[PDB]
Design a protein around this ligand. Structure first.
Ligand code: CAC
Length: 161
């Protein structure tokens, strides 16, 4: 039932909206990555960005989404690179729910910080892609295909920045 408290934030410079995995989904993610050979963000850090908005003049009002359930399918793990070209392990999410929330925010004058919204959950921000890590990612993606994993998120949480 966590929700975007827009009017408390309407006068901020920028808007960050994220959602947190449910208790059950936290346990599901932990069991998914049980055999991971590299260190990962801990369970308190796992969050899914829904809006990264650097607009300094936010709209005065909006139609706030307030979805009733937030679901996503854990599609796969893949490797991204950060500013300094360091490897990042992220969990790609297939989520019509989160796409819809992001679209609802962007269409009302809240621009997202990337040309397309890519729902994902970052699992490791600094990551040595070695044979063990690659085997882990491969087996996890095969597991994600053989056993569909759906995640649920509890609310929408908004902060400045
Ligand atoms: C990523 As959190 C808001 O569950 O500490």
């Amino acid at each position: 039932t966590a929700r975007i408290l827009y009017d408390r934030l309407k006068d901020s410079k920028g808007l960050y909206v994220f959602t947190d995995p449910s208790d059950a989904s936290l346990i599901d993610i932990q069991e998914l990555i049980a055999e991971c050979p590299f260190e990962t963000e801990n369970s308190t850090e796992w969050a899914v960005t829904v809006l990264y908005c650097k607009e300094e003049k936010l709209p005065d009002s909006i139609d706030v989404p307030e979805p009733k359930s937030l679901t996503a399918r854990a599609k796969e793990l893949t490797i991204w690179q950060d500013h300094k070209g360091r490897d990042i392990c992220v969990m790609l999410l297939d989520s019509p729910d989160l796409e819809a929330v992001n679209r609802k925010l962007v269409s009302q004058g809240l621009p997202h910080g990337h040309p397309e919204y890519n729902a994902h959950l970052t699992l490791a921000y600094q990551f040595e892609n070695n044979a063990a890590a690659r085997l882990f990612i491969e087996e996890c993606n095969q597991h994600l295909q053989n056993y569909p994993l759906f995640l649920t998120f509890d609310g929408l949480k908004a902060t400045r920045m």
